[PDB]
Amino acid sequence: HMRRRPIRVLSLFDGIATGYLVLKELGIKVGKYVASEVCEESIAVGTVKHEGNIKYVNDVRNITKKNIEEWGPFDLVIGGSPCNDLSNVNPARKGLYEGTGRLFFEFYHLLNYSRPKEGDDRPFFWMFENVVAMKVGDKRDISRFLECNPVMIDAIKVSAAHRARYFWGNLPGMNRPVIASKNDKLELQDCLEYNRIAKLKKVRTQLFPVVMNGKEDVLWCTELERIFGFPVHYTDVSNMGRGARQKLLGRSWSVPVIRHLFAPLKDYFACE
Amino acid sequence: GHMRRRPIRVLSLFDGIATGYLVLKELGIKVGKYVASEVCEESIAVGTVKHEGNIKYVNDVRNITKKNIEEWGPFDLVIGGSPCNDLSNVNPARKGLYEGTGRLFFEFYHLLNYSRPKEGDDRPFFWMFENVVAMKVGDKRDISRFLECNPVMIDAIKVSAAHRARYFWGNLPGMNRPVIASKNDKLELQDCLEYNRIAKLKKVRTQLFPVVMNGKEDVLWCTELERIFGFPVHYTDVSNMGRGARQKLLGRSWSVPVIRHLFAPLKDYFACE
Amino acid sequence: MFETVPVWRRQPVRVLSLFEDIKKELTSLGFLESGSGQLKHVVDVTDTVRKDVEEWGPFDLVYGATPPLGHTCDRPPSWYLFQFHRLLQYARPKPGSPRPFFWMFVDNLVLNKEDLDVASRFLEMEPVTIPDVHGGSLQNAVRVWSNIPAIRSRHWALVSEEELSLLAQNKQSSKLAAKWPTKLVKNCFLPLREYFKYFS
Amino acid sequence: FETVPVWRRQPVRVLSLFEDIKKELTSLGFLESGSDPGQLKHVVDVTDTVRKDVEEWGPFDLVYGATPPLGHTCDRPPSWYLFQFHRLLQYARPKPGSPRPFFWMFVDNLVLNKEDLDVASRFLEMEPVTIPDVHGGSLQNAVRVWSNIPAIRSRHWALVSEEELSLLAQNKQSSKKWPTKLVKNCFLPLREYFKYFS
Numbered sequence: 001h002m003r004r005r006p007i008r009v010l011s012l013f014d015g016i017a018t019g020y021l022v023l024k025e026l027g028i029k030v031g032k033y034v035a036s037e038v039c040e041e042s043i044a045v046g047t048v049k050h051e052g053n054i055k056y057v058n059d060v061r062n063i064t065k066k067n068i069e070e071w072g073p074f075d076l077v078i079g080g081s082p083c084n085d086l087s088n089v090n091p092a093r094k095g096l097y098e099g100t101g102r103l104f105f106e107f108y109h110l111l112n113y114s115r116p117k118e119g120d121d122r123p124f125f126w127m128f129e130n131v132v133a134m135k136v137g138d139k140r141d142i143s144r145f146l147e148c149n150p151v152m153i154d155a156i157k158v159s160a161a162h163r164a165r166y167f168w169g170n171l172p173g174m175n176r177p178v179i180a181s182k183n184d185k186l187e188l189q190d191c192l193e194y195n196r197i198a199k200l201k202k203v204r205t206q207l208f209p210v211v212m213n214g215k216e217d218v219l220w221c222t223e224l225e226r227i228f229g230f231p232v233h234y235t236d237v238s239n240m241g242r243g244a245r246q247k248l249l250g251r252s253w254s255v256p257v258i259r260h261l262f263a264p265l266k267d268y269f270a271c272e
Numbered sequence: 273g274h275m276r277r278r279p280i281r282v283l284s285l286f287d288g289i290a291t292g293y294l295v296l297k298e299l300g301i302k303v304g305k306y307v308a309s310e311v312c313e314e315s316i317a318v319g320t321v322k323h324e325g326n327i328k329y330v331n332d333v334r335n336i337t338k339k340n341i342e343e344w345g346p347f348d349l350v351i352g353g354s355p356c357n358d359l360s361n362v363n364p365a366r367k368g369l370y371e372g373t374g375r376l377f378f379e380f381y382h383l384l385n386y387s388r389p390k391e392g393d394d395r396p397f398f399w400m401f402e403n404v405v406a407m408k409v410g411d412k413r414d415i416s417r418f419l420e421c422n423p424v425m426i427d428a429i430k431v432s433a434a435h436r437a438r439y440f441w442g443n444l445p446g447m448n449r450p451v452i453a454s455k456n457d458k459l460e461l462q463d464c465l466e467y468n469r470i471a472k473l474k475k476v477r478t479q480l481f482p483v484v485m486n487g488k489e490d491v492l493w494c495t496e497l498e499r500i501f502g503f504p505v506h507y508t509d510v511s512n513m514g515r516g517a518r519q520k521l522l523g524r525s526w527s528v529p530v531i532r533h534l535f536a537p538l539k540d541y542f543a544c545e
Numbered sequence: 546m547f548e549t550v551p552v553w554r555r556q557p558v559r560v561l562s563l564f565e566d567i568k569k570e571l572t573s574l575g576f577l578e579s580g581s582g583q584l585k586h587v588v589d590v591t592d593t594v595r596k597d598v599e600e601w602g603p604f605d606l607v608y609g610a611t612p613p614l615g616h617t618c619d620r621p622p623s624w625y626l627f628q629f630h631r632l633l634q635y636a637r638p639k640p641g642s643p644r645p646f647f648w649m650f651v652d653n654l655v656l657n658k659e660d661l662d663v664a665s666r667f668l669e670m671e672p673v674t675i676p677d678v679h680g681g682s683l684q685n686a687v688r689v690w691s692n693i694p695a696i697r698s699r700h701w702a703l704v705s706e707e708e709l710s711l712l713a714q715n716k717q718s719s720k721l722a723a724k725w726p727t728k729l730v731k732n733c734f735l736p737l738r739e740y741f742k743y744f745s
Numbered sequence: 746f747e748t749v750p751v752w753r754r755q756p757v758r759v760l761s762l763f764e765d766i767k768k769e770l771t772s773l774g775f776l777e778s779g780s781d782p783g784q785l786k787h788v789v790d791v792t793d794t795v796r797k798d799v800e801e802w803g804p805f806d807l808v809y810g811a812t813p814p815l816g817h818t819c820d821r822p823p824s825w826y827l828f829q830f831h832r833l834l835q836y837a838r839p840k841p842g843s844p845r846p847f848f849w850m851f852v853d854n855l856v857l858n859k860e861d862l863d864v865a866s867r868f869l870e871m872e873p874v875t876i877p878d879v880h881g882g883s884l885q886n887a888v889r890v891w892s893n894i895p896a897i898r899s900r901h902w903a904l905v906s907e908e909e910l911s912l913l914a915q916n917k918q919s920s921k922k923w924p925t926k927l928v929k930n931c932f933l934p935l936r937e938y939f940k941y942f943s
């Protein structure tokens with residue numbers, strides 16, 4: 001029997017630090033959070049919104065077997081590799097073995113380095129995420145390398161957006177049913193600013209979802225942030241304009257989904 | 273007996289990003305009515321969203337009629353800061369108080385007299401007009417001749433991290449009293465920057481890269497510019513506005529702590545929460 | 546608005562004349578008396594404040610005018626109008642003692658289209674076009690804002706803004722001396738005979 | 746690792762992925778012909794091979810993998826061979842509790858493109874060895890080899906450029922069997938550790 005200690009995380013393709021935000025708002029103490037990420041606007045959101053508690057290490061293809069020993073041990077390894085080469089939305093997508101799709105094998109590679117060796121029964125948790133709209137042979141091949149089948153969690157149950165994703169991993173209770181919270185904003189109108197009216201009740205991924213003063217309009221950054229369950233102004237960082245912020249949020253994890261998946265980790269690590 | 277204190281009824285000309293309404297609500301004063309004349313639709317977006325439709329927007333100052341003032345009134349406070357691009361030494365091609373956007377002052381002076389109470393009316397009526405110090409002497413003189421009073425100069429440097437020297441004509445209670453900073457005012461520029469950013473200088477002016485981060489220079493961030501002017505953080509994160517739009521509106525605004533100093537005595541003349 | 550009271554009770558009119566002096570035209574019509582003075586004439590009102598106007602007064606007639614057409618102005622033409630509006634307010638009767646009070650601002654085609662809208666909002670009326678027509682052609686013209694009763698009957702709708710603007714485009718280039726066509730405005734004061742003394 | 750005398754050296758248990766090297770290996774004496782039908786496992790489509798499959802077939806002492814030949818119309822992306830080889834190679838590694846001689850080799854016949862070469866060398870923890878077939882001062886064929894077999898690096902040719910291979914990869918496949926001669930003789934250093942057959 002071992003006393004609770006703060007959690008040590010390795011986040012590949014970390015984006016805007018969703019994994020750290022969910023862990024902190026869950027009250028889990030974070031001893032170490034090594035994020036691997038290359039987008040400078042992305043790094044900036046995480047750097048200031050979490051006050052340099054994240055250790056950025058850049059390109060996932062330059063992380064070495066000895067980097068994983070030095071930085072580790074890790075109690076949790078998470079990743080959601082880029083998707084627009086595995087999505088059937090993309091007509092010009094190159095699949096799991098070309099383009100940015102082969103970045104999955106980097107997560108698979110680093111996972112095994114991160115994994116405890118034989119004789120080490122210490123807890124080790126990991127989760128990998130990608131899009132539901134893949135070729136079935138890609139879904140199979142990812143399941144074969146990770147040695148497990150995915151769970152399908154759609155953010156619609158907990159947010160106001162259609163966001164169906166697969167989650168592979170070994171987190172406690174990934175299969176348990178997803179239950180929405182009182183604070184979740186389930187309908188779009190729950191995310192809109194003053195004097196703005198929602199055309200539909202859930203947004204998908206209409207190009208003008210809102211009507212203001214009897215006239216169409218696009219969503220606002222502050223509104224997108226609420227749709228993805230992020231704090232308002234979470235991406236008001238480093239003079240980023242509209243186009244940058246909505247790109248980061250478009251690549252993002254829906255935070256209530258992650259809150260759902262990471263929530264059992266409270267019973268395994270030191271908490272405030 | 274004496275007069276009951278009632279909600280204040282404001283006519284704000286050239287309202288910008290609604291600084292007057294912010295200061296008033298932040299002071300706890302009750303706002304019965306706040307009529308803003310403002311043309312820039314981004315500015316109107318901020319006031320609309322940040323203050324949830326409480327502001328009544330009436331478009332160009334030059335379409336406000338004498339009948340408009342009597343219907344929309346009575347007003348207890350008339351405030352205005354005209355545009356300054358034609359009255360300041362910063363612009364060498366400035367055209368002054370009588371042409372350009374400078375002559376918008378006479379539109380404030382004009383509507384002030386419409387709103388002023390009649391001779392027999394002893395009701396409280398306050399007004400304030402603002403403009404830049406860097407002004408031709410004869411323009412300063414003419415404004416004072418039209419407004420029948422001399423101005424007090426209040427530099428935001430005393431209460432904020434910027435150099436912002438401005439002239440305030442008016443009859444607000446206690447304008448001439450000394451400006452004393454508050455516990456929560458962010459005086460040095462380091463108090464305004466985000467995490468891991470160091471302030472070259474202690475006050476901003478009006479280098480071109482006043483902050484260095486990880487050994488390389490950088491411009492200011494809107495979230496930081498908002499702290500420099502005393503606005504709440506993300507007060508201009510409205511309607512997909514980008515960097516340029518936000519620092520445009522913030523560049524022509526009043527310094528929030530300075531307006532607070534000017535308006536705080538009003539708590540004694542109007543109903544509060 | 547105001548009543549007519551008999552000639553035995555009509556007093557001399559008290560005139561404030563700004564920028565331009567209409568002393569001669571008013572003597573010519575019998576509102577002034579030959580050789581004195583009831584007219585205060587000020588060319589520069591920059592440091593004139595309210596109590597200056599209160600001291601010189603009271604006044605029954607406030608008159609203002611732009612520099613003549615062709616004369617390069619000492620200032621922006623709107624200055625004559627803002628400054629006129631300023632002093633006009635100083636000279637107004639207090640609502641406690643109302644009395645016959647009249648004002649008039651005249652432009653000799655100096656104010657441009659922007660200035661004109663400014664003038665008409667501040668003076669609360671569209672201007673009256675009084676032209677000097679000779680041989681069926683336009684010789685000169687002034688624009689009049691005023692509260693004298695008959696003034697809106699001197700208007701000539703026949704004079705177009707293009708015709709006014711072209712008259713200004715040539716009278717400017719002419720190298721002749723500029724003469725203020727007071728003849729055009731002098732006849733506008735005749736409705737005031739019923740309120741103030743006539744001098745023979 | 747203790748080096749046995751010859752008399753109870755054991756027969757190499759081999760797992761051969763994508764290409765079959767059974768008869769190249771009997772040519773060197775590692776498998777006795779007519780011998781048990783288990784000494785060597787061969788699989789071509791490992792799409793549904795799981796960990797327990799490799800555990801059942803094994804244990805193995807040598808795990809070999811190779812891409813298709815150059816002129817061969819390949820249907821799979823070239824990296825599939827390397828990723829699938831790496832995947833199964835892990836399944837067949839000895840547990841750290843039971844250490845034993847364990848060897849592996851991956852061979853590329855100029856099918857992996859340049860971007861695939863760094864991921865290959867990152868996954869296999871080693872830069873590749875270039876074994877060319879040179880005739881008459883001109884480059885005829887070549888293989889790239891990743892392997893922990895003891896001598897592999899001494900069969901390298903630094904004389905063969907990376908552009909020289911790329912242009913041979915352009916030209917020769919345009920016109921167009923597996924060049925196993927280039928790879929056959931790398932296994933010789935394994936002769937000490939396992940039984941030789943005559």
Ligand SMILES: Nc1ncnc2c1ncn2[C@@H]1O[C@H](CSCC[C@H](N)C(=O)O)[C@@H](O)[C@H]1O
Nearest residue numbers: 013014015016018039059060080082252253
């Ligand atoms: N070679 C590489 N190394 C590290 N990160 C990379 C990378 N290539 C792409 N990425 C990043 O991987 C991300 C995949 S989208 C995943 C975002 C993240 N899961 C979130 O919640 O925000 C992108 O943000 C992209 O910037």
Ligand SMILES: Nc1ncnc2c1ncn2[C@@H]1O[C@H](CSCC[C@H](N)C(=O)O)[C@@H](O)[C@H]1O
Nearest residue numbers: 286288289291310312332333353355525526
């Ligand atoms: N013709 C006009 N009528 C009404 N408003 C005008 C105007 N011309 C300019 N403005 C507005 O008047 C403002 C002058 S600068 C003052 C801004 C304000 N004091 C603040 O704190 O935000 C600008 O925001 C501008 O959009």
